[PDB]
Structures are given as structure tokens and as C-alpha cells.
Assembly symmetry: D3
Homo-oligomer: 163 residues x 6
């Protein structure tokens, strides 16, 4: 067989989100980004001439991005935020006693500790593998999946999993 | 004399901000963008060989961007937001009764009606002309100033003023 | 009022097509391109804070592109091609007696003389104005529409209409 | 010694071709692309200060691209196309009985099964190594050659060989 | 008739040159740039379907660039440089008594006062019109020629002539 | 733990320098480039949610670039240049007896043999590790550092060190 590595990357694989960084002894102000996601994978070229169809990769990256897009990204497991449910809002209180409140529907609660590029990348990697489907990946011989997330064109984090 | 048109554009001329769109009968969710600003100008080439030094354009675009960067962009003159001062926060209430609250220091209050690309462009154009200095522009023979603001690589608004 | 100029441009505004150039005393070989379309317009900023919503521009550029995408572009009005209907194919004969045949369904017949970037740009401009809708443009105060078509990143043609 | 990895990539390393995808139970329509080729290699920095001269890499990528450019890409080993020689044309018949005919001189017959990005990448990799010359590569200490082919900016396949 | 505007722009339209800025009361250090040139023109679409063939524009931009490429750019008409011919070198003395010497063959003497982007743009515009040929432009109905020169991706000057 | 790989890359990580290539039996003319530097690193995501803060990477890449920027790059260890100190200049004599002279302050003397992209990359890699600080990198768990240097957008060299 012949190994090939596929890359899909596009201005469409975007989610335009608000967030703020907080960790021990530090809190940044609320702001936002046009995050962008690329996906790279490795498998053998199949009898149909593809490792896996690009169209499916594009469909599923778009799907995951679309869930995050146009929301405030809210970590679930942060040790430095107090996240309160107040009526139909999340009220967030930082260690410096700064306070924020957002409609719950404007927020996407993600099982991460920090809304950093790195942790968001790991989350997306796990979601992309679920959406494309792990058994389906293995039928295509895919053995490696890698996600790059950029928070702006100049700063990216890349994570992978051997499958 | 010889007319020349200068363009300065860069990933540095950025402000990474949160905002949300609201106008009559419409409210989007809180989200964010890596806004980018380019500046174009026209004047005659001076005896020193420049219309105006690129370094000054870069310094001042960076300065204006830096004031907006890492904040929630809050319009001052919106007819569809109720903006309340609560302790050290701005509490914002929309026509659909959605409610937000942010530390005032996380917000940049801008004399616009909507945090649209177009209105933000007009605001930046006016600020850039103040920062570079209008009399200084006229000493360099500059007669045209134009700002492009992008909210993402695929959507830009451009405004100008004849001076 | 305040004039603003909007630009929408994206790798999505694409149509990946085959074509070949033929004009008097010249015929190139069959080949293809990832054509890309940008749209620029001018109007006044409306009470909602937009000249016109970017989402509608993106929707309609995508629509026009999608009709052309994945087809052979066939001119209707060429003076140097003999275009024959043979069963469910178009058979095309050039002045040098070169012959081609394609399934009609693989072809998009366009009311142009040459599949040049310039003529394709004029065709798209006319189609985009129909799709977005001319009366709707005038309600938004749009007075200028301009299309750029690229046949590769290094060669573009731009056409406009005052409306 | 010191390992270095060289990358050459450029809008010039292009071939603007028509093709169509066909494999069992599937046929797309005729269309085209601005394919782009990048080359990456690894060797030790030589006493002249280069792993290998960039100019030679650029010359040979251009050469291989130029053979494919402005042609229909025709696979030789497809199990789902019937490729007939008719006078000075290739007549191609698909499993759904769709029929195409092209002048042979407009076609480039390539020893692949599918005109997919992956198979085209393997073909180019093999050709680039022949053109630059394998013994010449080994005199420069090059031990790794890798080709990326893009069919559009958003979809790429990458193949390599250890030499 | 139909007006169209053509743009050609490419990483190939490059000249990698050394220069330094000097004007009254100012001298920068010797350094260099990958200058890039784009050309924009306006004419009517001709009976062959082109305003003018892109290939000719590309050929001639490459030609002009190639004359400047890999040289020190030496102004002829500077009021602040003393340019001496010493054996087979140019010895250049600045107002601060700084001194440089280069082989004449490493230098390209250009009829400008300052090696600024603006003056280099005017020079290239004049050369491009000579190379493509003014009478030939008028046979194609071209009435406007415009050159953009960038000294780096973030700083460009644009000059034009109505013809 | 979770491995992540960070990339920082930007038009700001630039140094606009003059240089010329000389090695045995070869000398190019004086010219220049907008060199660009990217940095890639690998470590584990720390309890603060970062492998290492992007801001520190950006600060230090800028610092190293800034030392080289706006100078002639002068190798220290070339076997084919005769480098003489003459008053406040370096006079450089090549094997073909070509002669150059530059103010010492316009030159940056770098401990390399050739001003090639590869050797400049190794030098920058070593400097970046010193500037960010090796012990500080190891506190962040960083185990891999990699620098890419481009002399123009189309030609790059990449070097790394396991730490
Ligand atoms: N490593 C890293 N650094 C950062 N610095 C500032 C903002 N975000 C980030 C981020 O998400 N990751
Ligand atoms: N015209 C325009 N349209 C938009 N659509 C969605 C979000 N923002 C915008 C915006 O800022 N301007
Ligand atoms: N002006 C122009 N020139 C061209 N040259 C070659 C191929 N296509 C074209 C084209 O579409 N337009
Ligand atoms: N993997 C892969 N997928 C594709 N999907 C559509 C068209 N071409 C392709 C192609 O060439 N490769
Ligand atoms: N306007 C202008 N400004 C500059 N600043 C620094 C270096 N070059 C330039 C230049 O060429 N033009
Ligand atoms: N490999 C390599 N080749 C080159 N060719 C020309 C100029 N510089 C270079 C260079 O710096 N590296
Ligand atoms: Zn952020
Ligand atoms: Zn928005
Ligand atoms: Zn073509
Ligand atoms: Zn295709
Ligand atoms: Zn310079
Ligand atoms: Zn060089």
C-alpha cells in the first residue's frame, strides 16, 4: 500500500467566538477571535483512489465549528471561575471578583479547564473523531488524526491522536 | 508633481474584540472577531521621496487598534440597547429582554449606533486622522484617507474622506 | 449619509470548471481552473447599521458559483466553434478541425462568446444582480456593483455596473 | 552534520488541468483545477552552505508541472473507464454509459488508476525524483522527498519516499 | 463596448534587491527587500474576448523585474549621495560621511532621486509601458495603467498614468 | 499529559537584510530579502492551559529578528571571503577579486560560513533558545524547538533541536 496524508483547511472552518483567559493569579478581559480549524490525517490510498473523501472531512469540520460559532466559550472544569446559574443566564465570577453575566443560550459549555487554543484543539479533535466516526475512519485505514486550531493567523496549537 | 497612493496592511493592525449585533427586530448572540484594519492614502511624492513615512502610518494604526483590542465593543448611541451602570459593570438589556453584564473596564464605549464593520470603520477613520494629525497630513499633501475594516478575512467595509 | 463600500471574497466563492479558449486563428487545449469570484458594492449605511447584510451577498455569490461549478463552460455565441447536439452530448468542432464531445449535463451553456475571464465576469455580474435582486439593492441604496473573477490567483478581471 | 529541511512552494508550481473522478458506482462531471505542487526534502547542509540549491528544485518542479499543465488528465489503469482510440481522439466511456471525446494531444496519459490528488501526488513524487535525479540527490545527502499536491487551496494530499 | 480592468500579481513579479534610504538629515543602513510588482489596467474587451492577453502582461512584468533583481538599487539623481566611479566600483558617500563601495555590475543605476517605493513604482510604470509598447496598448484600447510596488507584504505604493 | 505543538508565524517576524552568496567557484551579486522566521515547539499543556504563553514566543522572535533587521549579513567563518577592517568599514574581497565596502555599523557579523537560509536558520534557532532561555523552556516541559526561515515566500529552510 501507499501512505498518504490529507489536509483540509479553509476560511469556512471557522468559529467566531468570545472568550477570556483566566488561570491562577491571572484574568484577561473579555474579547474574541475568528478561530480556524484545520484537519490532517494519514491512511492508505483505497481502491477508489482516496484515503477518505475530502467532502466528508469538510462536512464534519464545518459541523463541529458551527456548534461553537457565534457563542461565548465557557469552560466547565475551570478551577478559577465561579459559574452560577441565574435565571436564564450564567453569571461568572473571577478570583479578582470581576463579574460577567451572559444568556445561557449565548454560551457553549465545553468540557475544558481553560478556553486556550490548546484545550480547545483537544476538544475539537475528540469531537471530529466522533462526528466522522471512529469505526468509519478505520474502514478507510486512517491511523492518525491531527487538528490545528488558530486563534488568529499568527498563533496556532496542534494536537493529534494515533487511532 | 506625481500622485502616489500608499497602502499599509498587516496582521498587526488587529483588534481582537467581542461584540454582538442588535438592531430593530434582531439580536445576535455574543461572539467575537479578529478585526483587521488597512489604511490607504493619496498625496504627492515629497522632496524626501515619500508621500508620508510608512513608519508613522504603522505606528498610528497600531495605536488606534490597541485601544479597541481585547475589549467588548459597546455602542453609545444604539436605539435598541438599554445600557445601565451597575457598580463597576455595564448591564446591557436587549429588546427581547436578553441581559448581559460586563466589567466596564472590559468594554470600550465607542460613539456608534451599531458594532457593525461599517460604523466601526467610520469611527477608526476619524480616530486615525486625529492620531496622525490632520494639519500634519496636509503638510505632506495627503488629500485622501481610506480605511478598510475586516471582521473576518471574507467580509470587509471601506470608508473614506477627502481632506 | 455615509458612503461605505463592502467587499466579500472567499475560497468558497469558487467554481472548478473545464474550458478552452478559441478565437480566430487560435485554439488552446482543454484544461481547467478553480475560478474565484469577489463582489464589491457601494451604498449608504442604513438605520440598521449595514449597507446590506454580508450574509445575503455570501448566499447569492455561492448560488451563482454553484451553477457553474463542476462543469465544462460552453459559450453560446462563439463565432469559431461549431456546437452540435449529438444524442445527449454536445460535440464541439474548432476551426483547426479539432473535435470534442461532452455529455450535455457536464456542460453549462452561458450566453458569452469566449470563456475568458472578462466575459465570464460580465455574465456573473448580470446574474448576481438578478439573484440578489435589483429592486432589493435599490431599497438598500446600493448604487454600484462590481465583480472580480480570477482564473488563478495571479490573473483577474473586474467589471462593474452603476445602478 | 546538521539536518535541514527545505520547502519550495509557489503559485508557479501549477498545472491547470481538466479531469473527472470515476470509481465503482460513481462518476463526477468534467471540471478542472489549478493544481499546485510543493516539494519538501531533508538532507545535511553541505560545505557550500546549501542542502541542495533551491534553483534546481524550482526548475524541476516547474518542468514536471509544465508537462501536465493545460491538458485533460487521463488515467491509464482505471478499472471503470473504457478508453478507445478514435482517429486522433481518445473516446472515454463510463460505467453509466456517459461518453466523452478529446483530441489525444489535449490529454496527458498518466500511469494512475484515478485522477485523484493522492495518485497524482505519487506520480509527481516519482517524476520529480527522476528529473532532479536520484544519484544527484544522494550526492547532496538528501534522504527524504515529499510532495504535496493541492487541487484547490483547501484540499491537499502529501506523499513521501525515504531514499 | 464593455470596460474591464485586468490585474496581474504574482510572487514571480519580484526583484530581490539591496538599497538604503538617504534624504536630507537622514540615512538608513544598508538592507534589502523582496520587492513585488502588480499591474492593473483598463480597456474594452476585444473581439477575441480579452482586453489584452494576460501572458504578455506576465512576460513583460517579469522582464522589468528581472533587470532590477539581485542588484543594489542606485539612484542617479539623489541630492544627498556622492557617487564616485572607482576602478570597477561605485563608491557612495553620504552626508554623515558614511562610505560604501560596490562593484558597478552589482548595481542597477535608475533615474530616480530616492530608492523609495514610490519612485521605484513611477520608474517601473514608465518601463512597463515601454516594454509592453504604448502603441500596442492603444490597439488593445487600454486607457489606464497602474503599478503597485510592495517593499514588504505590509507597505505598498501605487502609481498610474492615463494613456 | 497531553502533547501539543505550538506555531507562531507572522509578517512581524521579519528582518529585511542585504547579503550575497559566495562559496568555492561561485559569487552572486549583492541583493537582499525580507526574511521571515516561524517558530514551532512541542511540550505538554500545563496547569495554566498553555504549553508556553504565545506572547513570550512573539516577544523573543521579534527580539532576535530585530538584531538582524536593516543590516548586511556578514558571515564570520567563510573560507572564500577576505574580510578586512578599514577605518570604520568592513572591506570584503571575493575569490574573483570583486570588492565591497560597508560601514561596520551597517553589518551584523554572524558566526556562520555562508549567509544561506539553512545556516541563518541554525543561528536563529540557537539564539531563540538562548533568548527564551533553555531552563525556562524545560520548566514549561518544552522538548522540541524548530525554526523555519524563509528568504522569500517560495523558499524556506527548517532546522530543529531536541532539548
Ligand atoms: N499558549 C497560548 N498562549 C496564549 N496567550 C494569549 C492568549 N491566548 C493564548 C492561548 O490560547 N495559548
Ligand atoms: N454588512 C454587514 N453585515 C453583517 N452581517 C453579519 C454580521 N456582521 C455584519 C456587519 O458588520 N456588516
Ligand atoms: N486577458 C486574458 N488572457 C488570458 N490568457 C490566457 C488564458 N486566459 C485568458 C483570459 O481569460 N483573459
Ligand atoms: N480524498 C479526495 N477526495 C476528493 N473529493 C472530491 C474530489 N476529489 C477528491 C480527491 O482528489 N481526493
Ligand atoms: N513612504 C515610504 N516610507 C518608507 N519608510 C521606510 C522605508 N521605506 C519607505 C518607503 O519606501 N516609502
Ligand atoms: N538551498 C539554498 N539555495 C539557495 N539558492 C539561491 C539563493 N539562496 C539559497 C539559499 O539560501 N539556500
Ligand atoms: Zn483570546
Ligand atoms: Zn460579528
Ligand atoms: Zn484557461
Ligand atoms: Zn476535481
Ligand atoms: Zn528598505
Ligand atoms: Zn539571496
Amino acid at each position: 500500500d501507499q501512505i498518504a496524508e490529507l489536509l483540509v483547511e479553509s476560511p469556512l472552518f471557522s468559529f467566531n467566538c468570545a472568550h477570556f483567559i483566566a488561570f491562577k493569579g491571572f484574568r484577561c478581559t473579555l474579547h474574541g477571535h475568528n478561530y480556524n480549524v484545520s484537519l490532517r490525517l494519514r491512511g492508505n490510498i483505497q481502491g477508489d483512489g482516496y484515503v477518505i473523501d475530502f467532502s466528508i472531512l469538510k462536512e464534519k469540520v464545518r459541523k463541529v465549528c458551527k456548534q461553537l460559532d457565534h457563542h461565548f466559550i465557557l469552560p466547565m472544569y475551570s478551577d478559577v471561575l465561579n459559574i452560577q446559574e441565574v435565571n436564564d443566564n450564567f453569571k461568572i465570577t473571577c478570583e479578582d471578583n470581576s463579574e460577567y453575566s451572559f444568556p445561557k443560550r449565548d454560551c457553549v459549555q465545553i468540557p475544558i479547564k481553560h478556553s486556550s487554543t490548546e484545550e480547545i484543539g483537544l476538544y475539537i479533535l475528540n469531537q471530529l473523531i466522533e462526528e466522522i466516526d471512529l469505526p468509519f475512519l478505520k474502514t478507510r485505514s486512517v491511523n492518525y488524526m491531527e487538528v490545528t486550531v488558530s486563534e488568529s493567523p499568527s498563533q496556532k496549537a496542534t494536537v493529534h491522536r494515533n487511532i
